[PDB]
Structure formats: structure tokens, C-alpha cells
Design a protein around this ligand. Sequence first.
Ligand SMILES: CCOC(=O)c1sc(N(CCC(=O)O)c2ccc(S(N)(=O)=O)cc2)nc1C
Ligand SMILES: [Zn+2]
Length: 258
Amino acid sequence: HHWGYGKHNGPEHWHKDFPIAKGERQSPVDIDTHTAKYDPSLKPLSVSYDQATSLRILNNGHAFNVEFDDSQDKAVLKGGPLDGTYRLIQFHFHWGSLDGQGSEHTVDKKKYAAELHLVHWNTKYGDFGKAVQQPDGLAVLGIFLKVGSAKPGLQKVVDVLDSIKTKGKSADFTNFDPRGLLPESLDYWTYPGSLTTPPLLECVTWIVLKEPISVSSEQVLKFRKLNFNGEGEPEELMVDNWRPAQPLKNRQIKASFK
Ligand SMILES: CCOC(=O)c1sc(N(CCC(=O)O)c2ccc(S(N)(=O)=O)cc2)nc1C
Ligand SMILES: [Zn+2]
């Protein structure tokens, strides 16, 4: 009876195994754009993905992850609200059963169809597993998806999905360039928060881009054909793998623009 997003093990349940679910710096949150403080001391974000080495794509039973070689400074996030250098380890999405829901963060309570998370760890801690134990261990770049025009840079991901339909399936996924998933502007909001799945650790500096990317209806429909279950188990479509907004508590969301 492990955690999930089903009818009996979803976000409302997670606190029973992971009590930090009711903590003081949980994610996601609603971004109230009028209350967010413009901070002129924030720097432009530096996203250096030219040398990114993607390796593999994996259905982990809760999303799909595109994994990168993070054994050298190859794809790093710096600047913005960050001190030091954070290395890209993987990206994944959260999405809905319908175009009207799917994002984890919301903007003035607006839900987007999906949300992309580019997960990076602080190289001062040496590896991802040590970084998640630290308050400034991770930096997750969050990008909203809306349904409209296709995102050409997403299509290679969409086309490999039927090779990883079920939980535990993986596929080689080399030479994928994550710059193809960025919007034009790097304006952002930032706040201190957490992982949005168990173990819900409070180790994340969140950086959420204001500008969503557009993906086509056919592209997000393909995300919704994935399965939460393993091969030869009854089919449970992988949809609605997002956690609702959590109480902001004693936190301020800062804007880099405005
Ligand atoms: C024992 C301590 O380990 C951890 O805290 C984590 S978090 C973590 N993952 C990726 C793998 C998976 O998704 O199954 C992860 C989950 C949500 C996020 S999110 N949604 O907050 O960006 C980022 C990374 N892996 C590990 C081992
Ligand atoms: Zn995520």
C-alpha cells in the first residue's frame, strides 16, 4: 500500500508515512502574482545546457524521468536566487486527465495542463542523495505547459513513450537537448520549498518561469497513455500525478521582474 495518486493513496494520505507533508516549507504553492515581491537584487537565471548528456528515459511508476549524466559540470543552473552551481540530474512532468488541470504550482489559482521540473543538485554536497538532506540542496526549475501549438523540442520525448508504457520500463535516450523545452523568457518567481512527492524533503529552491511553453493536444494526449501499473497488471492510466497547492505559511515568493 505505497504512495501514489490513486483513489486511496494520493496526496491527502501521504502525511501518514511522511509527516513532513504538513511542514513549514512544503510545495507546490499557489503563486499570488500581486503579493509576490519584485526583488531587484535577484539575478538573471543562468541555464547552461549546451553540454548536457541525456542517457535514458524511465517510467518510475509515478511519472517518466529523462536522466542525465551528472558526473561532471555539463548541464548547470546558476545565478538567479542561487549561490553556487547546481547540476542537472533529470527532468520529468506532472499532468492532468484533462487540459484544465495538471500543474502543481498554480498562478492566481490558474492550473496549467502540465508542469515540467528540471531537477538540479548543489555541487557543494557532492551527489544528489546528500543534497536532498540539505536546506539548499536542490534547485528545481519549473515550467508550465499550456495546450496550443506543438513544442517541436518535446517530440522526441513523446515518440519514445510507448516504449516505456508501464512501471519500471526504460529506454536509451541519448542526445536529447533540454534547451528545446525552455520558453523564450527566463523571468521567474522563486521561494523555498520541498520535493512535491514523497519523501517531501524540504531541500528545494524553487524557480518557476512566468512564461509557459505551448504543447499540442496530441503531445499531452500521449503523456496520458502511459501507465502507473507494471506490465501485465491491470491498466491504470498515468494521469493526475500532481500534488495540490500547500499552505504558504511563513514564506515570501520573490519575482525577478516587475
Ligand atoms: C531518500 C531521499 O531521496 C529523495 O528524496 C529522492 S527525491 C527523488 N526524485 C526522483 C526519483 C523519482 O521521481 O521516483 C525526485 C522526486 C520529486 C522531485 S520534484 N517533483 O519535487 O521535482 C524531484 C526528484 N529521488 C530520490 C531518491
Ligand atoms: Zn516534479
